[PDB]
Design a protein around this ligand. Structure first.
Ligand SMILES: [Ca+2]
Ligand SMILES: [Ca+2]
Ligand SMILES: [Ca+2]
Ligand SMILES: [Ca+2]
Ligand SMILES: [Mn+2]
Ligand SMILES: [Mn+2]
Ligand SMILES: [Mn+2]
Ligand SMILES: [Mn+2]
Lengths: 235, 235, 235, 235
């Protein structure tokens, strides 16, 4: 199977796989059963922003999510990503719906990785504030599309803007990312994305994740709903 | 054939295809016969730096090359790159040798492209200050290799560090680059590379170019020597 | 007197000092009588964005202004800023009202200057997306205030949000900016600001400018209205 | 007295104020008696690089120092800098000599601070790779000079390049830096400097520090030698 490190914005509490009984932000290390969660006051139909940060000195994966006019939610987990992930990875966004549903709309997505050696800097940076019909520097998987209202729709939306159930889709940056090099004295990354999660229902599902994977990563079979397009099962 | 826009650091004067009678920097628009050149006081065995800049407001492709302790050479040419290049491109470095030869060593390579819309910014940035044996975010073509002394060798070098004749190689960034979008009010790019051109001979050949191409670009047949791995002929 | 290079968003046509008979974007070199103008379809009460770019290779000062859902206006002028401005400068925003009036609200302001030598990079960058009551890295002159709705108000606004006539104010970045150095092979800058110009009247006045000045620059006496807080007279 | 947070490259072991018995990197919170140290294999006459990183989510101040061809030294300390430093600060470099001496030469210095709100980004960035005689965007204190070989000499050097004893000097960036804002959901900074510490003696002294201070910070009386131009005493 794929190797996955993810930050999840989990809109639907599945308490039998260890979700808390509310929408939550979580850190996922090779399992949909988050190593750490925090309560998330998700706002149906409002534009949110998530920030993810990590460096190889501190070995702490941290994330913050907020809306305008609202308090933030934050979560952290101590993990050395050089012991979890391979040297080369792809970075992406993933979302799903199940029998409960929501839009998984991405308005913007930025990523920066830096490797400083003892010589110094290797860097990759991308920023999307608009997506075109044919976004050649993304790999779209499953139901993901680009260019509707200039946005990235990770899951299926009807012509009327209405979200569909039982949907899964991801977008990965085309270029592999080098997150470990033998001469690096500091390796760091940060990601930001802005999202619009909207549902006609009181119980939206299932969420959006930022993820880092082996470069050949694909949507596992049956990873709609609670598995967020990331994991083949709930182990 | 491929569509090529290049800046050439041309080490060897081929006066029958319109080179001036000295090493020169040139702007190449779909032809090895530069639209504009400037004299270049090339220094055998010294580390140089080239800078390339362009924006869609000015529509002027400009370049500067220098060595420490030396004056610069500069060249400019008025060209609208939206009338020459497709919407999506790849960016790369190219070099060649012929019956005369030189090392075509790249120590560092950076590129930034920005598209600002009327909404604003889509950006791509990469920086290499070291190259590994397996550089997964480059496409290496012909004789190009990575990881020898942490460098990119565009043309064949022996174990002893000695340059080979009749060699051609290129490196392209893995991800396609979006240089025109319908909503963009300003589109800009800049590139920098540092190079070491060394030859045991008084007459080194043939040079190094920064180039922008159709995304599927490959080394044309018989593009060693004066054609710089860029053009299938001297038209 | 001060030395001023400015890009003006001129909301009010003063045809006796050579304004065209419509709102316009202009390039001002040591005179309120623009060296070049373009028609500007100014939108009362809409958030706009202006971009300014320059480099020492091309010696061309260019600007673009747009609103969401609208075409852009652009203007360019060939000028070597090393022949106009001193080696060290301050960068700022300026606005005014007269007997006609408007808000001169700045929501965001970014600036980047780079000097690349033949050794390479000296850089300054700042970005404001929010302004606090006490913004210690700005010099506020005349009626300029910060922190109202998190914004920079260049000219006087009442508690009710209503613009006042006969007002002039500027904001300069605290740190001097080095725009020429003897070893530089390329010197470049870019600025962006987003603005909200709103008036209860069919004829708003007078406009907003991005400017570069001697470091000790101050608001000239009687530079309300058509002189934009930049010039002591209309010569 | 001033409020100081510093990372020290301490070349001389003063074991009565808790230095370990070797050159060391340390984290200084309002005291020259480091809260944490690591052994530093200082190399007389070699160019080194130090990196400093912090963010308000992790609340961990970390630093790495290396030379080409050598292993790194790293130190970290958990500290919330919003509980130590005021909202607005200045950032700088400091060095000293005593009865033992060394050059405290700075070849390059970069700093980036970002405040992301829930609206997002306020940023400051500067990069020096060359220093001029009259560097108007630095405040030089005590014996610090700029422009000798294009470098920043923090402590007194003779015309012959020979370091002087009993010397203290600092350089602060001219513009105040905003490191806390009420709407910020993440605040981060990183600093890098490259240094050349050279001495004709087997026992160089005293070291170089990167520091953050109240904006009006000045060299305390009698802060030559072991106090590094940072502290008025060894408490
Ligand atoms: Ca769930
Ligand atoms: Ca030639
Ligand atoms: Ca006017
Ligand atoms: Ca000591
Ligand atoms: Mn969960
Ligand atoms: Mn040529
Ligand atoms: Mn005008
Ligand atoms: Mn110490």
């Amino acid at each position: 199977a794929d190797t996955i490190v993810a930050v999840e914005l989990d809109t639907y509490p599945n308490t039998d796989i260890g979700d808390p009984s509310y929408p939550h932000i979580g850190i996922d290390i090779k399992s949909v059963r988050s190593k750490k969660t925090a309560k998330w006051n998700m706002q149906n139909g409002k534009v949110g922003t998530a920030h993810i940060i990590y460096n190889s000195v501190d070995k702490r994966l941290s994330a913050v999510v907020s809306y305008p006019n609202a308090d933030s939610a934050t979560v952290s987990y101590d993990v050395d990503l050089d012991n979890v992930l391979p040297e080369w990875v792809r970075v992406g966004l993933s979302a799903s719906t199940g029998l409960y549903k929501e839009t998984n709309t991405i308005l913007s997505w930025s990523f920066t990785s830096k490797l400083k050696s003892n010589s110094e800097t290797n860097a990759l940076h991308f920023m999307f504030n608009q997506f075109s019909k044919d976004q050649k520097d993304l790999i779209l998987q499953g139901d993901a599309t680009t260019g509707t209202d200039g946005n990235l729709e990770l899951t299926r939306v009807s012509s009327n803007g209405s979200p569909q159930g039982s949907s899964v889709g991801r977008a990965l940056f085309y270029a592999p990312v080098h997150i470990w090099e033998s001469s690096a004295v500091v390796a760091s990354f940060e990601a930001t994305f802005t999202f619009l999660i909207k549902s006609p229902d009181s119980h939206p599902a299932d969420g959006i994740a930022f993820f880092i994977s082996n470069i050949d990563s694909s949507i596992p079979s049956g990873s709609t709903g609670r598995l967020l397009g990331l994991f083949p099962d709930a182990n």
